[PDB]
Amino acid sequence: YDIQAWKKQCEELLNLIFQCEDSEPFRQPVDLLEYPDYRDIIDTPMDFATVRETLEAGNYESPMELCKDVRLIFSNSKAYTPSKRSRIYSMSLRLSAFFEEHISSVLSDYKSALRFHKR
Numbered sequence: 535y536d537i538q539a540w541k542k543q544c545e546e547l548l549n550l551i552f553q554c555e556d557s558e559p560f561r562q563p564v565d566l567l568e569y570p571d572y573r574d575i576i577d578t579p580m581d582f583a584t585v586r587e588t589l590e591a592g593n594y595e596s597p598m599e600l601c602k603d604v605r606l607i608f609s610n611s612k613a614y615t616p617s618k619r620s621r622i623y624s625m626s627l628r629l630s631a632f633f634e635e636h637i638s639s640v641l642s643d644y645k646s647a648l649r650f651h652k653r
């Protein structure tokens with residue numbers, strides 16, 4: 535029932551994500567000289583450095599907010615991909631499965647801790 539524990543849990547999960555080869559396309563923003571049309575399609579960019587920085591700044595209030603931003607990384611990849619069989623998109627799907635597998639307990643524990651706080 536520790537309503538702060540999610541923050542270190544998210545830091546550790548982000549550390550795992552940065553160690554994963556599949557995260558490499560998603561660790562920083564998109565060079566427009568490499569993907570000129572990127573910001574025609576994607577009006578709300580997100581990457582794992584921005585998520586980590588937002589967390590470390592104290593600018594997430596809950597793991598739900600962090601989860602929203604991580605999911606935006608994946609939805610951006612799905613929206614920008616020219617194909618379901620794109621290498622970078624395929625990396626996004628594996629990393630998303632890994633992230634969802636790990637964030638599930640963080641969200642459950644936070645929400646349970648907040649319900650106990652308000653009991």
Ligand SMILES: O=C(NCC(F)(F)F)N1CCN(C(=O)c2ccc(Cl)o2)CC1
Pocket residue numbers: 558559560561562563564565568569610611612614615616620622623626
């Ligand atoms: O350029 C980058 N990342 C920045 C880096 F290269 F510095 F790491 N991306 C390429 C475009 N992105 C996609 O999600 C995507 C889906 C299908 C195809 Cl193709 O791209 C985002 C990641």
